[PDB]
Design a protein around this motif. Structure first.
Motif, short mmCIF file in Angstrom:
data_model
loop_
_atom_site.label_atom_id
_atom_site.label_comp_id
_atom_site.label_asym_id
_atom_site.label_seq_id
_atom_site.Cartn_x
_atom_site.Cartn_y
_atom_site.Cartn_z
N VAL A 202 3.05 31.31 20.65
CA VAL A 202 4.35 30.91 20.11
C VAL A 202 4.79 31.93 19.03
CG1 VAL A 202 5.65 29.15 18.85
CG2 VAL A 202 4.01 28.48 20.62
N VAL A 203 3.86 32.34 18.18
CA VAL A 203 4.19 33.26 17.07
C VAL A 203 4.65 34.64 17.63
CG1 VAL A 203 3.25 34.65 15.14
CG2 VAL A 203 2.90 32.19 15.23
N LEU A 204 3.91 35.20 18.57
CA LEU A 204 4.23 36.54 19.06
C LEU A 204 5.49 36.55 19.92
CD1 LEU A 204 0.79 37.94 20.03
CD2 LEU A 204 2.09 38.57 17.99
N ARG A 205 5.70 35.48 20.68
CA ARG A 205 6.84 35.41 21.53
C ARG A 205 8.13 35.13 20.75
NH1 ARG A 205 6.98 31.35 26.49
NH2 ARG A 205 7.19 29.88 24.74
N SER A 206 8.03 34.28 19.74
CA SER A 206 9.18 33.92 18.91
C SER A 206 9.63 35.09 18.00
CB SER A 206 8.92 32.66 18.06
OG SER A 206 7.91 32.82 17.06
N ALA A 291 14.44 42.70 29.38
CA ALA A 291 14.13 43.89 28.58
C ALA A 291 12.91 43.66 27.69
CB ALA A 291 15.33 44.29 27.73
N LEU A 292 12.54 42.38 27.51
CA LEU A 292 11.45 41.98 26.59
C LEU A 292 10.11 42.00 27.31
CD1 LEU A 292 13.92 40.90 24.98
CD2 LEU A 292 12.46 38.96 24.33
N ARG A 293 10.17 42.01 28.62
CA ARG A 293 8.99 41.78 29.44
C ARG A 293 7.81 42.68 29.08
NH1 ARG A 293 7.71 40.29 35.72
NH2 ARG A 293 5.65 41.30 35.66
N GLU A 295 7.12 44.51 26.31
CA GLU A 295 6.53 44.28 24.99
C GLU A 295 5.82 42.91 24.98
OE1 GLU A 295 9.08 44.84 21.44
OE2 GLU A 295 7.47 44.09 20.12
N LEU A 296 6.34 41.93 25.72
CA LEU A 296 5.67 40.60 25.70
C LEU A 296 4.28 40.64 26.37
CD1 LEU A 296 5.83 37.67 24.69
CD2 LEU A 296 6.84 37.08 26.86
N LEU A 297 4.19 41.24 27.54
CA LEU A 297 2.92 41.34 28.24
C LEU A 297 1.92 42.13 27.43
CD1 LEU A 297 3.99 41.87 32.01
CD2 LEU A 297 3.61 39.76 30.72
N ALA A 298 2.38 43.17 26.75
CA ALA A 298 1.51 43.96 25.87
C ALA A 298 1.04 43.16 24.63
CB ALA A 298 2.21 45.26 25.44
N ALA A 299 1.95 42.46 23.97
CA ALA A 299 1.58 41.73 22.78
C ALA A 299 0.62 40.60 23.16
CB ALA A 299 2.80 41.19 22.05
N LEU A 300 0.94 39.88 24.23
CA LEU A 300 0.09 38.75 24.64
C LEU A 300 -1.25 39.24 25.18
CD1 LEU A 300 2.58 36.20 26.23
CD2 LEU A 300 1.78 36.36 23.88
N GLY A 301 -1.24 40.33 25.95
CA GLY A 301 -2.48 40.82 26.60
C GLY A 301 -3.15 39.79 27.49
N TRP A 329 3.69 33.03 30.70
CA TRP A 329 4.45 32.86 29.46
C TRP A 329 5.71 33.70 29.36
CZ3 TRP A 329 3.36 28.40 28.17
CH2 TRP A 329 2.06 27.91 28.33
N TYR A 330 5.76 34.83 30.06
CA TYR A 330 7.04 35.51 30.28
C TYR A 330 8.02 34.67 31.13
CZ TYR A 330 10.56 38.56 32.00
OH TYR A 330 11.80 39.04 32.30
#
Length: 419
Positions: A202-206, A291-293, A295-301, A329-330
């Motif tokens: 929730v923190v990284l995605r928000s 466009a977020l995809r 960075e999201l996959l990278a941050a979540l890992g 989660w994406y």
């Protein structure tokens, strides 16, 4: 300050219930020193709970007697629940998406309910490590709560903690469903994520929404079905899209502010009801999310996850959830929310009790719409400006009076006064 207790009465009929209310009030008026905290426990544990039930949630005599007089006279009251004890079937906890939060929620309940306080402190620990800030401080800060990177994690902590409070009165889910943002909380409550790992998501995605999407879109709920909304979106292709389908009379659309305001003119002219989702400053569940995809996959890992201990009905697919990996989660941000489908799948598998775990009920009317014609109990938890243990107990009473098992006696005190 006196503490609220649930004072239960019942009869075989509605007229029997009303007469029992009048009799209890008369008994109390004959005994001026007698409080709700003296009589509540035996009324639950020493009396049959019959077909027509009421509870007055009261902390003092005067408020109990006000409830009882209303009940005796067939009138509604603000801390009176009543109903027919006729509901059977399995229990769903619903976690809603963004738009239910109200500033100041959870502070009062933190003071009043030690199970909720505890969960909220366990959340604060995990969020401290991640986001820096102190959960309890942010609860009352309207400026911080307008920020999506603060609101979403606070909202997550609140609904996880309300779920823990429900569990403490013996209301545990047979299944869960989380609408958009609420799916992370649902996954945690279902045992598929640790508190820490859910919080990380929730923190990284928000924070990523706040950086890349906030200020560039808006979301609008329309009282209409998706067929109708899609017809009205003719000419809005690629500008305003369907973001959620919640029920036959609730569809949410998403897009850039200007374009959504153009769509609002279409609705207004046609006397259709709609409203912006409060506190949502981004076009969720729209192509803006593409466009977020990366960075999201990278941050979540890699996500640390496990099989849910109870069924988790995804609103990505409207079906039981598979792998809860980063791609999931994406899609929980990108793809339209299939809330109606998820609830419908649960109704078709014998679920008849739906508890919205929220600061204020936003999806209950959709669940009611979908459930027809089945006999069901559908309740929220808190309401706007009603964040007290008293409001939580009233929600628990709303289940009790429909014959759903709940342990009201956990909060009924230590009374031994009879009759």
């Amino acid at each position: 300050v006196p503490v609220p207790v649930p004072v239960a009465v019942s009869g075989a009929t509605t007229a029997g219930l009303r007469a029992q209310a009048a009799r209890l009030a008369g008994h109390l008026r004959e005994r001026p020193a007698l409080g709700p905290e003296a009589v509540a426990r035996p009324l639950l544990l020493s009396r049959a709970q019959r077909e027509r039930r009421a509870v007055v949630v009261a902390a003092d005599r005067d408020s109990l007697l006000t409830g009882l007089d209303a009940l005796a006279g067939g009138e509604a009251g603000p801390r009176l629940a009543s109903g027919a004890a006729d509901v059977t079937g399995r229990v769903v906890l619903v976690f809603p998406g963004q738009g239910a939060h109200w500033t100041g929620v959870a502070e009062r309940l933190w003071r009043e309910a030690p199970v909720f306080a505890d969960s909220m402190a366990r959340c604060a620990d995990v969020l401290r490590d991640l986001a820096g800030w102190e959960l309890r401080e942010v609860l009352v800060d309207p400026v911080a709560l307008e920020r999506v990177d603060v609101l979403q994690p606070v909202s997550f902590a609140v609904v996880v903690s309300l779920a823990a409070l429900w569990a403490s009165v013996g209301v545990r889910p047979d299944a869960v469903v989380g609408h958009s943002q609420g799916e992370v909380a649902a996954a945690h409550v279902a045992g598929a994520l640790t508190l820490a790992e859910a919080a990380r998501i929730v923190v990284l995605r928000s924070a990523l929404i706040a950086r890349e999407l906030s200020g560039r879109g808006a979301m609008l709920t329309v009282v209409a079905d998706v067929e109708r909304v899609t017809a009205l979106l003719a000419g809005f292709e690629g500008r305003v899209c369907v973001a959620a389908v919640n029920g036959p009379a609730s569809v949410t659309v998403s897009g850039e502010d200007g374009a959504v305001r153009e769509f609002e003119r279409v609705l207004s002219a046609r006397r259709m009801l709609r409203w912006r989702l409060p506190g949502v400053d981004f076009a969720g569940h729209s192509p803006q999310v593409d466009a977020l995809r990366a960075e999201l996959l990278a941050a979540l890992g890699d996500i640390a996850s496990r099989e849910p201990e109870i069924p988790l009905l995804s609103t990505v697919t409207g079906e039981p959830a598979t792998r809860l990996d980063a791609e999931h989660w994406y899609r929980n941000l990108r793809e339209p929310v299939r809330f109606a489908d998820a609830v419908t799948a649960l109704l078709d598998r014998g679920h008849r009790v739906f508890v919205e775990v929220s600061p204020h009920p936003v999806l209950t009317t959709s669940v009611v719409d979908l459930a027809a014609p089945h006999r069901t109990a559908v309740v929220g938890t808190l309401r706007r400006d009603e964040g007290g243990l008293d409001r939580f107990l009233l929600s628990a009473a709303e289940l009790h009076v429909r014959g759903v098992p709940v342990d009201l006696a956990r909060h009924a005190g230590a009374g031994t006064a009879e009759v």
